[PDB]
C-alpha cells in the first residue's frame, strides 16, 4: 500500500493520519514544556555579560535620539523603565569592578535581566551574539586539535588528558614535540601557528571576560531547550493539521489550490504555535482559528489573481459585492450603481471605477465554436508594425528633401543639416551650432529665416506641397 | 520622425490633436439609411439627435 496513487492528496492524508491528536492535559504538558525550555534559554542567555553590554549599548542609542522606545523593551514582566535601567548599569558596573563577587553579582544580574520583558528581536540578537563568540571559540579549538592531534599524530587519549580543562598554555604544545617519538619532533614550523592560535583564543577569553568551559556548558544547555521548544512545537503542529485542513475546506473554490490553502493554513497554524498561551485557560484551537484564517485570506487576496489587487480594494470589492447582494434579496432585482451611491458611503465614481475593473483575463487558447478548430489567438493582430506604404512615404520623403537641400547653397545645407536632426545621430541645438560656425546666434536665426523664406517661395517644392494627403 | 520638424517649419502646420476613428460604410456595399437608434448612460446629456 506504499503506491498505486498518483494525487500527492492521498499521500499527504495519509502522512497526517498516522499521527492522533491531542487532548486538554497534552496541551497542558506540552504549554508546560514549552515554558521550561523557553525559561532555561532565558537563564542561558541572561548569565553572560555581553547581553547586558548590548542592553547598555542599544539604551544609549535610544537616549541619543538614533532610535525609539518601543523596539527597546516588549512591557515589562516611562520613568519606572529608566529607573530599572540605571539600577541594571550600577549593577553592572559594580559587577565589573567585583573581579570572588563576580559569580553572584552575574547571577543577580542575570535575574533582574530576567525581570525585563525585552524584544524578541533582542533576544534573538544576543542569541546570534553567543553563536559567533563560540563559533570563534570552536573553531580555534579545532585549528589546535589539528595542529598537533592531525599534524603531529599525537595519542588520542594522551591528548584528551593533557587537553581536557587547560586549552590555553603549552600542555598540548611542548608534549607533543618533546616525547622522544620519532615523529614528534619534526613540526617547530607550526609550533608557531600553535602560537598564533594561543594567542587568537587569549584574545578572544580577554574579550569575552569570563572561561571557556562555561560557555560551553551555556551553549549545549540553550541548545538542548531549543531543540525541546522545536520537539514540542512539532508535536503541537501534527497534532492540529487536522483542524488546519479542516478550516481550510471552505475555501476551495476561490481561485486557489487545495494544497496552497493547507499550506497556508500549516504555516498560519505555526505561527499561532508560537503565540499561544495556555494560562488563559481557553482550548488551543479557538486561538488558532484566527490565526489560521487571517493566513488563508492574505493569501488568497494575494495570490489569487493574474494581477494584483491591494487588500484594502479586495475589502472594498468584497463588501461592495456582499452589500449588492443583499439589496438584491431584499427588492427584488439588480439595483443601478447611482442607487448604490445612496446606501454605502461614496462620492458615485468610486464605485464605477470598481466595477470599471477588469475582471480575469480570457483565455487565449479558447475556442469559438468549431470555426475550422480556431482558438481566440488567431484573431489578434499586432498594432505596433508600420505599413510598407508608409515606409515607402518617408524614404520618398527622405529623398525628396536630400534632393531639394542639395540645390541650396552649401553653407546653408550644412547649417539647415546641423540644426535639425538630419542625416546624424542627434540634432544640434542653435548656440552650440553658432559656436561651430563661429557665428552668432541672431545671425544664425536671421540666415534660418532667410532659407525659410527662399523655401516658402514658388516654383520650388512643387513635390513638397504634394506630400500632404488632406 | 526627422526632417518632419523641418516640414512644419515651411509649411506652418499644426498636428491634429484628435485621431480619426469614425464609423464607415464597408467597401464594396451600398444601400439606403433607413433607421438610426442611439443609446446613451445615465449622467450624459444627450444631442439633438437623441
Ligand atoms: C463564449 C463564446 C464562444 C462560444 C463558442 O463558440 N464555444 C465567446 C466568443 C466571443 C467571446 C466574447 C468576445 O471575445 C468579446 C468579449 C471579450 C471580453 O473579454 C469578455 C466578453 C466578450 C463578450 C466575450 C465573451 C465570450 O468569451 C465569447 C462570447
Ligand atoms: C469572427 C467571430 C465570429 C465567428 C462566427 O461564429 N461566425 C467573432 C466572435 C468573437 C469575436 C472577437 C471578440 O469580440 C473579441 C475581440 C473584439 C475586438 O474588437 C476584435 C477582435 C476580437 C478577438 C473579436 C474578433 C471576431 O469578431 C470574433 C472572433
Redesign the pocket.
Same mark, same amino acid.
Given at each position: 500500500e506504499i503506491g498505486r496513487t498518483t494525487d500527492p492528496v492521498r499521500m499527504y492524508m495519509r502522512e497526517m493520519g498516522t499521527v492522533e491528536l491531542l487532548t486538554r492535559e497534552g496541551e497542558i504538558d506540552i504549554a508546560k514544556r514549552i515554558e521550561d525550555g523557553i525559561n532555561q534559554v532565558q537563564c542561558s542567555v541572561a548569565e553572560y555579560p555581553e547581553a547586558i553590554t548590548y542592553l547598555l549599548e542599544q539604551y544609549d542609542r535610544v537616549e541619543a535620539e538614533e532610535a525609539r522606545l518601543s523596539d527597546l523593551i516588549t512591557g515589562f514582566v516611562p520613568e519606572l523603565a529608566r529607573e530599572k535601567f540605571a539600577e541594571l548599569r550600577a549593577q553592572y558596573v559594580v559587577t565589573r569592578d567585583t573581579i570572588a563577587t563576580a559569580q553572584e553579582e552575574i547571577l543577580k544580574l542575570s535575574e533582574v535581566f530576567k525581570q525585563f520583558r525585552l524584544v524578541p528581536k533582542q533576544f534573538d540578537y544576543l542569541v546570534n551574539s553567543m553563536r559567533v563568540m563560540m563559533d570563534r571559540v570552536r573553531t580555534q579549538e579545532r585549528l589546535i586539535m589539528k595542529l598537533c592531534v592531525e599534524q603531529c599524530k599525537m595519542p588520542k587519549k594522551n591528548f584528551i588528558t593533557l587537553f581536557t580543562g587547560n586549552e590555553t598554555s603549552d600542555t598540548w604544545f611542548n608534549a607533543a614535540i618533546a616525547m622522544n617519538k620519532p615523529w614528534s619532533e619534526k613540526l617547530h614550523d607550526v609550533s608557531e601557528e600553535v602560537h598564533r592560535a594561543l594567542q587568537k583564543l587569549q584574545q578572544i577569553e580577554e574579550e569575552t571576560g569570563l572561561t571557556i568551559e562555561q560557555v560551553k556548558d551555556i551553549n549545549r544547555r540553550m541548545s538542548i531547550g531549543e531543540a525541546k521548544a522545536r520537539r514540542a512545537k512539532k508535536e503541537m503542529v501534527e497534532a492540529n493539521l487536522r483542524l488546519v485542513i479542516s478550516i481550510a475546506k471552505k475555501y476551495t473554490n476561490r481561485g486557489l489550490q487545495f494544497l496552497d490553502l493547507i499550506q497556508e493554513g500549516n504555516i498560519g497554524l505555526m505561527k499561532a504555535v508560537d503565540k499561544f498561551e495556555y494560562r488563559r485557560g481557553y482550548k488551543f484551537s479557538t486561538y488558532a482559528t484566527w490565526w489560521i484564517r487571517q493566513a488563508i485570506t492574505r493569501s488568497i487576496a494575494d495570490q489569487a489573481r493574474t494581477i494584483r489587487i491591494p487588500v484594502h480594494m479586495i475589502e472594498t470589492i468584497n463588501k461592495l459585492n456582499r452589500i449588492s447582494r443583499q439589496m438584491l434579496q431584499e427588492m427584488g432585482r439588480e439595483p443601478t450603481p447611482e442607487e448604490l451611491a445612496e446606501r454605502m458611503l461614496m462620492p458615485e465614481d468610486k464605485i464605477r471605477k470598481v466595477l470599471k475593473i477588469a475582471k480575469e483575463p480570457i483565455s487565449m487558447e479558447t475556442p %469559438?465554436?468549431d470555426?475550422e478548430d480556431s482558438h481566440?489567438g488567431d484573431? %489578434?493582430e499586432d498594432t505596433t508594425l508600420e505599413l510598407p506604404l508608409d515606409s515607402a512615404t518617408t524614404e520618398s520623403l527622405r529623398a525628396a528633401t536630400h534632393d531639394v537641400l542639395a540645390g541650396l547653397t552649401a553653407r546653408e545645407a550644412k547649417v539647415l543639416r546641423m540644426r535639425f536632426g538630419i542625416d546624424m545621430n542627434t540634432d544640434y541645438t542653435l548656440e552650440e551650432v553658432g559656436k561651430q560656425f563661429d557665428v552668432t546666434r541672431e545671425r544664425i536665426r536671421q540666415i534660418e529665416a532667410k532659407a525659410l523664406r527662399k523655401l516658402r517661395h514658388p516654383s520650388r517644392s512643387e513635390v513638397l506641397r504634394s506630400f500632404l494627403d488632406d | 520622425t526627422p526632417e518632419e520638424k523641418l516640414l512644419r517649419a515651411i509649411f506652418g502646420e499644426k498636428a491634429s490633436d484628435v485621431k480619426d476613428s469614425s464609423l464607415r460604410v464597408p467597401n464594396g456595399v451600398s444601400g439606403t439609411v433607413i433607421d438610426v437608434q442611439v443609446f446613451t448612460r445615465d449622467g450624459v446629456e444627450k444631442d439633438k439627435r437623441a
Open positions: %469559438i465554436g470555426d481566440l484573431f %489578434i | -
